[PDB]
């Protein structure tokens, strides 16, 4: 009785929604975007190749500094890379070599990463000793560890596969804010630029909004069908790019609430893994299990380039926060560096 | 072109690379073994006798180091993170003899037998174990002879029409299991059968790993 | 904590061998080069010999080629000088100095406490021996360099190092602007191409001291003059 009429209420909730979000569709981002023009072909060379890892690599994350990044692999190490001359600065030998994400800090002081033992490590990289040693392991997870964010040196915001995310605290070891409504494994998050948000996406094929500080959700998209994998946040914070297994991309909207692109097309059939945007956010890179990274046109739909340097699923890419250039790492163990020539 | 201080750190970075070939060589001599199965089917007597999210269990036999995968603890979605372990060397997966007459305890209607049955039919037939084999382990062995003496076969299997015996019944499971082998050629499934008391089943593992050894080493060399 | 003791120095004749040790706790020893300077009485700091980590880079002044030699034994963490015929030139205090290398990394951060042996390339130039300071001043102290210490890579190989009276040198500044770990931030340095300059500000007591500018752009590695603070 009391169930039944509750679970009505939802579904009147939810048209409720539906029906304000059709409301604001006046019109559609093709049709704001049809007067501009294309980006052309979007050319990416080669420019470096990161060897060493020898096994599949899950993970890589630019510092801030863009020319210093860290890569995850299943060999059981973890690798910060010179990407100027090619140089490995450390390698940290992880305690459990399951790893599926690393991040690097802003500050560049600390590097973390976790995978199937459920533990988010902490590594401190500047050190009286002259080695990199794990600062703290965040246990608290009940399910594996998917996605990792710092928002500084004191506070990370991991996904794990329990279907919840949480913020820690990183001096107590304590998770603060337990961020909970997905019904499937989160495997992604991309904190806003501000630090203020982040979305996350989940194995439910939903996004949900999240506050860091308030810890409850906001806002919840909806739309791919199947599990997404990968979700990026547009440069100005007021939008998010998504993958998922069903081949394609989607551009939502915050403040309209709703899907505004999808990045699709015929041939490609395969689940992506990884997305993110360019510096001015007009390119829209997305990794493939096809072995191959597509640059879209993020405002027209329109494929611009394809990076095809890899021999096995591109697993993970990162672009610069100067937008110079853009790392792919893959499953064949290697990761290059891209960028376009005059 | 390289400063005083850049050679060094070329120089750095070489030494990185020589632990990071050091470190590959002896994980490539190492076996990794993936432990599956299903509740209350004797996994966890096996570790015993092979002495967080994932459980790892390190252990030599005749010169041989053993890494041993448990993730009964995963209880997140396997397709998601089951690729993790594409290029382990075996896969263990057990079976209950016993739980062939009984049921789920959540389901209520589906067989226990049966629910194994699926299991093993998806991980043998996963696309990334495609050419991995797999070491089946039978365990309950003296249990499951007990209650085929009051409990038929025929219960868990309608179109089983052999002995009522131990030796038989078995055999016939055994045939069940491999017959879901829907790549017969890219990969082999080393069956034993197992007991609470049994002392064998690492010497079954050493030696089924073994020819899992050489099968790869006649690939790599051109002679397969 | 991390420690460099040095040991084996004493009064030797002029001709004779002496062996040196320098053994390290507290931080990982295999993992940073090793340098030996020294520096004769009454006079500046001299670089003498370096091995690098894992020992396959090995350097030697020119005034001590051939006749010293440098080894390290990286389980024992021992850092080891041998020298043979040795001169009255070679009297000096001998200062055990660690440095790592890599993207970002602060060479030449510790120096060792030092042992004392008593026998019975680019010009750094410091003009301005001393400088009489009172505290609370700001005070500028300038260095020169016959090359440009300015890479094509973009660093400038300058390092500044501070030894107060009765104590071992440490690092200030090192590629001529990025400040040492527990270093006070009123120090900064400032330089272009081949002159440079150390601004102290608010000077304090604990900075009274001698003051060394050492390039890093090329071996031999070679000290300024050094400029001495006084009250």
């Known amino acids: 009785s009391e169930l039944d009429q509750l679970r009505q209420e939802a579904e009147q909730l939810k048209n409720q929604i539906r029906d304000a979000r059709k409301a604001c569709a006046d019109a559609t981002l093709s049709q704001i975007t049809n007067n501009i023009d294309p980006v052309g072909r979007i050319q990416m060379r080669t420019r470096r190749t990161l060897r060493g890892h020898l096994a599949k690599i899950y993970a890589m994350h630019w510092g801030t500094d863009s020319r210093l990044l860290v890569s995850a692999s299943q060999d059981g190490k973890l690798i910060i890379w010179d990407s100027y001359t090619t140089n490995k600065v450390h390698a940290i030998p992880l305690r459990s070599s399951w790893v599926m994400t690393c991040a690097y800090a802003p500050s560049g002081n600390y590097v973390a990463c976790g995978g199937l033992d459920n533990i988010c490590s902490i590594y401190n990289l500047k050190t009286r000793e002259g080695n990199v040693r794990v600062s703290r392991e965040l246990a608290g997870h009940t399910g594996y560890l998917s996605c990792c964010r710092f928002l500084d040196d004191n506070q990370i915001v991991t996904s794990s596969g329990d279907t919840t995310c949480a913020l820690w605290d990183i001096e107590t070891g304590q998770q603060t804010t337990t961020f909970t409504g997905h019904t499937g494994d989160v495997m992604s998050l991309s904190l806003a630029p501000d630090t203020r948000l982040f979305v996350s996406g989940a194995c439910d094929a939903s996004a949900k909004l999240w506050d860091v500080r308030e810890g409850m959700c906001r806002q919840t998209f909806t739309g791919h069908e199947s599990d997404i994998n990968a979700i990026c946040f547009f440069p100005n914070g007021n939008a998010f790019a998504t993958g998922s297994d069903d081949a394609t991309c989607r551009l939502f909207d915050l403040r309209a609430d709703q899907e505004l692109m999808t990045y699709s097309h015929d041939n490609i059939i395969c689940g992506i893994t990884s997305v993110s945007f360019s510096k001015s956010g007009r390119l829209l890179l997305a990794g493939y299990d096809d072995f191959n990274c597509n640059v879209w046109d993020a405002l027209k739909a329109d494929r611009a380039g394809v990076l095809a340097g890899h021999d096995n699923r591109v697993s993970c890419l990162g672009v610069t926060d100067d937008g110079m250039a853009v790392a792919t790492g893959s499953w064949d163990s290697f990761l290059k560096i891209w960028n376009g020539s005059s | 072109t390289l400063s005083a201080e850049d050679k060094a750190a070329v120089e750095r970075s070489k030494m990185i690379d020589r632990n990071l070939r050091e470190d590959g060589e002896k994980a490539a001599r190492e076996v990794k073994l993936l432990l599956l199965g299903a509740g209350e089917s004797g996994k966890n007597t096996i570790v015993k006798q092979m002495k967080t999210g994932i459980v790892e269990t390190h252990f030599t036999f005749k010169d041989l180091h053993f890494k041993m995968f448990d993730v009964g603890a995963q209880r997140s979605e396997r397709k998601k993170w089951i690729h993790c372990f594409e290029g382990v060397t075996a896969i263990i997966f057990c079976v209950a003899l016993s739980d062939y007459d009984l049921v789920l305890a959540e389901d209520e209607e589906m067989n226990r037998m049966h629910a194994s049955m699926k299991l093993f039919d998806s991980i043998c037939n996963n696309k990334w174990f495609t050419d991995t084999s797999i070491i089946l382990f039978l365990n309950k062995k003296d249990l499951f002879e007990e209650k085929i003496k009051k409990s038929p076969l025929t219960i868990c299997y309608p179109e089983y029409a052999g002995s009522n015996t131990y030796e038989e019944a078995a055999a016939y499971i055994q045939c069940q299991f491999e017959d879901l082998n829907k790549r017969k050629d890219t990969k082999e499934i080393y069956t034993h059968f197992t007991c609470s008391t049994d002392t064998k089943n690492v010497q079954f593992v050493f030696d089924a790993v073994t020819d899992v050894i050489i099968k790869n080493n006649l690939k790599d060399c051109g002679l397969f | 904590d991390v420690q460099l003791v040095e040991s084996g120095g004493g009064l030797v004749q002029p001709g004779g061998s002496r062996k040196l040790s320098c053994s390290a706790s507290?931080?990982?020893?295999?993992?940073?080069?090793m340098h030996w300077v020294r520096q004769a009485p009454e006079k500046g700091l001299e670089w003498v010999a370096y091995?690098?980590?894992?020992?396959?880079?090995?350097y030697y002044a020119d005034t001590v080629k051939g006749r010293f030699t440098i080894s390290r034994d990286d389980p024992k963490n021992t850092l080891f000088l041998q020298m043979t015929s040795l001169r009255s030139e070679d009297t000096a205090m001998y200062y055990c100095?660690?440095?790592?290398?890599?993207?970002?990394?602060?060479?030449?951060?510790?120096w060792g406490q030092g042992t004392t042996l008593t026998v019975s390339d680019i010009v750094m130039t410091q003009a301005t021996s001393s400088v009489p300071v009172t505290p609370g001043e700001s005070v500028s102290i300038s260095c020169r360099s016959s090359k440009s210490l300015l890479h094509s890579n973009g660093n400038t190989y300058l390092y500044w190092f501070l030894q107060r009276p009765g104590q071992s040198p440490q690092l200030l500044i090192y590629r001529m602007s990025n400040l040492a770990s527990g270093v006070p931030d009123r120090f900064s340095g400032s330089g272009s191409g081949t002159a440079f300059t150390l601004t102290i500000s608010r000077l304090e007591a604990e900075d009274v001291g001698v003051y060394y500018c050492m390039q890093h752009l090329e071996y031999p590695l070679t000290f300024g003059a050094g400029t001495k603070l006084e009250l």
């Open positions: 100095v660690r440095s790592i290398y890599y993207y970002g990394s602060s060479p030449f951060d510790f």
């Open positions: 091995i690098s980590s894992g020992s396959g880079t090995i």
């Open positions: 507290g931080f990982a020893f295999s993992s940073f080069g």
